[PDB]
Design a protein around this ligand. Sequence first.
Ligand SMILES: Nc1ncnc2c1ncn2[C@@H]1O[C@@H]2COP(=O)(O)O[C@H]3[C@@H](O)[C@H](n4cnc5c(N)ncnc54)O[C@@H]3COP(=O)(O)O[C@H]2[C@H]1O
Ligand SMILES: Nc1ncnc2c1ncn2[C@@H]1O[C@@H]2COP(=O)(O)O[C@H]3[C@@H](O)[C@H](n4cnc5c(N)ncnc54)O[C@@H]3COP(=O)(O)O[C@H]2[C@H]1O
Lengths: 198, 201, 202, 203
Amino acid sequence: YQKIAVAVAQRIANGDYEVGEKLKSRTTIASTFNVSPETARKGLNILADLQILTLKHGSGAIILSKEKAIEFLNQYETSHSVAILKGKIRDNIKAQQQEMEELATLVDDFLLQTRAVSKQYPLAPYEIIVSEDSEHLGKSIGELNVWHQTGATIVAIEHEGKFIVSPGPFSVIEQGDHIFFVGDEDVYARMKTYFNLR
Amino acid sequence: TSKYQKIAVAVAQRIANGDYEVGEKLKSRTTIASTFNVSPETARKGLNILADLQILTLKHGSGAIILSKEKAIEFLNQYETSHSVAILKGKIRDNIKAQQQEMEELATLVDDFLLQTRAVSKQYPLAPYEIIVSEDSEHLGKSIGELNVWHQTGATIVAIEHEGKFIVSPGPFSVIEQGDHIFFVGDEDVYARMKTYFNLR
Amino acid sequence: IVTSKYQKIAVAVAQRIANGDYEVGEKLKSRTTIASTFNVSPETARKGLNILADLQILTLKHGSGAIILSKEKAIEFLNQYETSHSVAILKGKIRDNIKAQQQEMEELATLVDDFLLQTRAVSKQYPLAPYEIIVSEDSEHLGKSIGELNVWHQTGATIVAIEHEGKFIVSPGPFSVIEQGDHIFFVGDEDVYARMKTYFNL
Amino acid sequence: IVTSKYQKIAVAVAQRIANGDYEVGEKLKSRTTIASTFNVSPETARKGLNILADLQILTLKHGSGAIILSKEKAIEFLNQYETSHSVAILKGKIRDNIKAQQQEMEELATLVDDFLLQTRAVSKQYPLAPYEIIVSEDSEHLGKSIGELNVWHQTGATIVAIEHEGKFIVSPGPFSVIEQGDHIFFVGDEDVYARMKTYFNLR
DNA sequence: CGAGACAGACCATAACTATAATATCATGTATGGTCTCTTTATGT
DNA sequence: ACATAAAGAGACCATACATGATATTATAGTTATGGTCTGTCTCG
Ligand SMILES: Nc1ncnc2c1ncn2[C@@H]1O[C@@H]2COP(=O)(O)O[C@H]3[C@@H](O)[C@H](n4cnc5c(N)ncnc54)O[C@@H]3COP(=O)(O)O[C@H]2[C@H]1O
Ligand SMILES: Nc1ncnc2c1ncn2[C@@H]1O[C@@H]2COP(=O)(O)O[C@H]3[C@@H](O)[C@H](n4cnc5c(N)ncnc54)O[C@@H]3COP(=O)(O)O[C@H]2[C@H]1O
């Protein structure tokens, strides 16, 4: 709505529209500023309320003054001087980067804080107890060479409730401990084969 | 995840955990809704969705019976292969990277934009005044610096048009020949003083 | 973070169990003990107790009461609760940042549209329009007079006016002094504008 | 990025004027001439001629037609239109970029929301759950077997399975080989997970 | 010199369109409610 | 000591108070096609 006002103010102040001659029709005015008759009349009423034009005759209006349009354009340019717009857009994009940095550090803190865990049911730890007598008891996982012998990967050993994960080749499985491991049904059977718990 | 999915995945997880046996009968809709913080309608929709996958059976207006664990297990494997945290971790990192690339593109765009603009102001108090030094003056045939224009008249010369060729920001050396057009800034008083110096009244 | 009444009851009962105030063998009552204790409605209290019993924290027998079952399960449930609450708080803060950034997006869009309007309205300006630089940044040249700077000889620019506190000092002369944040209006060409920009550190 | 028919008429007529085929003092009709050439209605052609004459290029006279006035004004109008077109296409590009940013932003919002679902699902997931590592970056350790790497001695981790092409190699053993982009599943504690992360070059 | 025809401009309406507001529906929670089951007390 | 009856508590349920989101409708908007009237030019 203010676009038509500033355009007609520029045209009046330029001297193309001198004070005496009548204004163009609202149709031509609307067509020139790529706007429509409805906006046009709204802008003309605004400009009239600024005591710069009088809309008394439907065919056109007689321009009342020139310095008033100059003053209105001065106020608008003081509000909108391009350079002030350049400062505003630069500050605004610096702000843009500020919120992006804040969001980046937030998401980075979130990312580092959380530990990723899985839920694939195929790979659930089966728990088995080694109460039965075995020559394989009193021996280290590395000593028994578990995987080549049974195909099992030991995930944890429960001795007197002392749960230990990723046991390595040194941990020794005592009698009556609970061995937790992965593999398929065949691997589970082989583990019961090695320990004779089947 | 659909609102009519959270309930399905939660119920399937509880079934797979072993809380509900095959012969066991499920609780009421409002029980599930209260335990999973949803409305009874949404819980019912989720139960219907799960029954469409035939983990659950519906032979009663409100009752339901556990049917098979392995099918629910497969449903969990599908859901995990679609959402397993680590894959979401990769997505949340890649989306941040893509947004940073978009911001860099925007920064380059706006920088090129500002470089291309190079715009001037439109101040009406800054409007120039065109005078014609056609009249004889001792001040003709002299350099702006030689005349010392500002102290003498208060005017700041912005341009000396020589037969169409403007000399903007002319400096102290440019010499104003007779009949040239001097363009300058100042107030009405300054314009009068300039006409005083050049006797163009 | 806004939650539900029965959620605030459930977590409170979980902390009470963790505190050890309620014995493992005590039989509590949702209709009278819990409801009277936390001044909440009959079914609300029950909802909380059912949430606890889902996690095997409590056992709910029809017509009898809730019975304490486990301690470490309650501790684990509590810890999961703080983890989920932290995740939700971070989600809310992210959402606030997101809304602010979207609003700043529309702000930038409106600023660009207004600049397009200004650029289109240039057709009716007066010829020989002076340029305008705002000296926001600091340069040794600040706090000096035009004459001390010898501006035309440094940059090729002829200053037509300087803006300080919304006042335009048209036709400045030598004694006039450039100050930080002011708008300097000057005539010249593309080379002159670039030279002035380099000179003022901007 | 789009314009009106009368704007196109005005710019085309201005370019044709700049070509110089029309005289500096030539007269032209509209309803039976410019309208027919561009296959456009008489009033849109009038609109185009009115916007062209508004900047003091042409003069339309009631029931007389138009007369050519200025060349330099036409050139200036062409320059102004080029600048306006550049500004408009830049505006369109900015709008497209912001829309893409907003769509990606909602995507991020939903993605971080779904973490609430995964965290709430943790309460009922089976104990001793292994971790999950996606080896997307390149490490010298890639293309080697678990046994060659001697993984447990390097990181403290026990690998329970590796995912290649949506296939999980449960209970891998030594000959199994880690490949780029695969998911490595392993048991351990916080220290073990951090060690594995440092080893595979994946902050 | 007068009359008729053609062209242009202005007043106008309709169609293609987008945005903004309001209403309705769904997801939700809490409270009031009713019915069933279990436990305790009293009577035979 | 055993059986029956009554009371209390818990669970399943529905409705109302509520808020948020989505969809639809209306209004503001602009452009194009339209018609009528007036003015100017050409021809008789
Ligand atoms: N508005 C301005 N824009 C750009 N630079 C400015 C300026 N005002 C002052 N300066 C610079 O300061 C120097 C001294 O200016 P001052 O006004 O004392 O002394 C000036 C002035 O009295 C006069 N003068 C020069 N050009 C003038 C002009 N366009 N209008 C009015 N007077 C001018 O000649 C003297 C020497 O001028 P010179 O150019 O050698 O040297 C100038 C110039 O380099
Ligand atoms: N799934 C896995 N996770 C982590 N690291 C793995 C691994 N598979 C192999 N490695 C690493 O490679 C080395 C050789 O493994 P390999 O299977 O040939 O030879 C192994 C294996 O036959 C057996 N073994 C050790 N731990 C085992 C276990 N938990 N389960 C089954 N067998 C095991 O003892 C041998 C020596 O074991 P060590 O730990 O000294 O050395 C191991 C280990 O450092």
